[PDB]
Structures are given as C-alpha cells and as structure tokens.
Amino acid sequence: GQKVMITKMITDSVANPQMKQAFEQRLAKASTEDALNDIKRDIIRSAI
C-alpha cells in the first residue's frame, strides 16, 4: 500500500506547500518500485 504510505510521508515531512504539491504530482505519476524508492529517497533527504 505504498502510495497511501508515501502520501502520508509527504504530509508529515514536507511543510513547504509548493514542495508538497510537487512531490504529490511526482507520486501520482509513478508506480514502479524503482520510481517509488527514488521519491521516498528524496522525501527522507528533504527533512535533513
């Protein structure tokens, strides 16, 4: 159930609303395990 999980990651982690909209556009347009890991990787980094 990765898309729900990563949508919640974005909500929790990304406070800047433009970054949030871009990640959600990114997430909506990806579906493979490779693409999802790369989005997750950038969400994790963005909170450092």
CB of 17 to Br ion, least distance (A): 10
**Distance between CA atoms of residues 1 and 3, nearest Å:** 6
Q: How far is the CB of 14 from Br ion (least distance, A)?
A: 12
22 or 44: whose CB is closer to Br ion?
22
Q: Which of 9, 10, 8, 6 is nearest to 33 (CA)?
A: 6
Is the CA virtual torsion 23, 24, 28, 31 positive or negative? positive
Binding site for Br ion (CB under 5 A): 21-22, 25
Least distance to Br ion, CB of residue 10, Å: 12
